[PDB]
Structure 1
Amino acid sequence: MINIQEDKLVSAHDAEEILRFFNCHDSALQQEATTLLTQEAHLLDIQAYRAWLEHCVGSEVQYQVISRELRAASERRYKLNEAMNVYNENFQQLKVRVEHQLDPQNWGNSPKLRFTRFITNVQAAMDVNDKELLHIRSNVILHRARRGNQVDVFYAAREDKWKRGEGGVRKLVQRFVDYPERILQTHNLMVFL
């Protein structure tokens, strides 16, 4: 589809991802993906973080959100680290964060937070080389409300890889988000996108 010499604003990475969902459409895989993500969002919204780990997250997971430095469109010399990791978690690290949420001395969680997630634009395709790896792309709006008048809304595109694990349950083995706002205006990014 895309030629990135002509479509001058498109990254090689973005063009690669689009080719993945264009070639073959299987609306049944798309339905499994929609259900998978809707249930994950439901668990996260009710703050069932243990259930999320057990049911949605694979032992080999990489859960990653980056913030990319603003560079000139024509830049071509400066070659230092392009991005930092807001998240770059293995399962054990996710577990630490989940423990942190559930701890009765996490003062920030009293009174209880309120989360509402909106998942849209779901696409799904099997990897060509590993026939057990499911690629799922989806976009999220995440609304977090706390303490009367604090309201923070997050927006992101998610590049996921999901794979059948324990008991044949499909679980997340990679999530990649390149967060679209460079300077956060939401107090922090302490939410599972």
Structure 2
Amino acid sequence: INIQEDKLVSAHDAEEILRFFNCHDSALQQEATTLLTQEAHLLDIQAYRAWLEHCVGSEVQYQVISRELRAASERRYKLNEAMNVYNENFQQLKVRVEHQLDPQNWGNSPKLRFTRFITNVQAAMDVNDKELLHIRSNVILHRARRGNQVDVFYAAREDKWKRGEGGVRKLVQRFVDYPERILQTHNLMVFL
């Protein structure tokens, strides 16, 4: 993509497109789909410890940002463009998991209901680290609780996955640029 011509495209987005339009491997797309479907299943049934153990690498960065709305023509204002809704290492994810599992987390009674829809899976091996797998996918996440509370989240996920203990591919980076600036879901207390 020529971003001087395609005026609405960011350099980052153009870079990410390039990585998937190259070596298409059908088998890798399928592996990626299985990996993400199993991850989503563990999360949906709230098996958060199993998710950590089976899906999340010790060196993980798990990051969801919220970008301040700026003018398309803006070129002078150069202060922090985004904040981190999440920016977690493994221990920080573990804290969040223990918070979910704590029997005095009053908000988790009655039990929440999660349903995740994972689509648009793309996969490509890194060029310089043949053990690093880039996976892109989109998620719709439905959270229902307390009779009539319903919150639906929508996001694109830029992941890196790498083989870890026992040869199991695990998440080493997830990056989400959350598309809604003001959340209308009470909070973002879900693992995208």
Query: What secondary structure does 1:144 align onto?
Result: strand
Counterpart in the other structure of 2:160: 161
- TM-superposed CA distance for 1:133, in Å, is 0.1
- TM-superposed CA distance for 1:136, in Å, is 0.1
- TM-superposed CA distance for 1:86, in Å, is 0.1
Q: Deviations over 1:7-39 (max 9, x none)?
A: 000000000000000011001000000000000
- CA distance in 1 between counterparts of 2:29 and 2:154 reads 22
- TM-superposed CA distance for 1:59, in Å, is 0.1
- CA distance in 1 between counterparts of 2:153 and 2:123 reads 23
TM-score by length of 1: 0.99
Q: Deviations over 1:143-164 (max 9, x none)?
A: 0000000000000000000000
Query: What secondary structure does 1:158 align onto?
Result: strand
Query: What secondary structure does 1:8 align onto?
Result: coil
Q: Deviations over 1:86-107 (max 9, x none)?
A: 0000000000000000000000
Q: Deviations over 1:74-122 (max 9, x none)?
A: 0000000000000000000000000000000000000000000000000
TM-score by length of 2: 1.00
Q: Deviations over 1:165-186 (max 9, x none)?
A: 0000000000000000000000
1:1-193 matches, within 5 Å, as: 2-193=1-192
The structure 1 segments of at least 4 consecutive aligned residues displaced by more than 2 Å after TM superposition are none
- CA distance in 1 between counterparts of 2:73 and 2:165 reads 47
- CA distance in 2 between counterparts of 1:166 and 1:63 reads 19
User: Tell me, which stretches of 5 or more residues in structure 2 are unaligned?
Assistant: none
- CA distance in 1 between counterparts of 2:101 and 2:108 reads 9
How large is the RMSD of aligned CA atoms in angstroms? 0.2
User: Size of the alignment, in residue pairs?
Assistant: 192
Query: What secondary structure does 1:4 align onto?
Result: coil
- TM-superposed CA distance for 1:43, in Å, is 0.2
- CA distance in 2 between counterparts of 1:167 and 1:31 reads 20
Identity within the alignment, %: 100
- CA distance in 1 between counterparts of 2:57 and 2:183 reads 29
- TM-superposed CA distance for 1:3, in Å, is 0.1
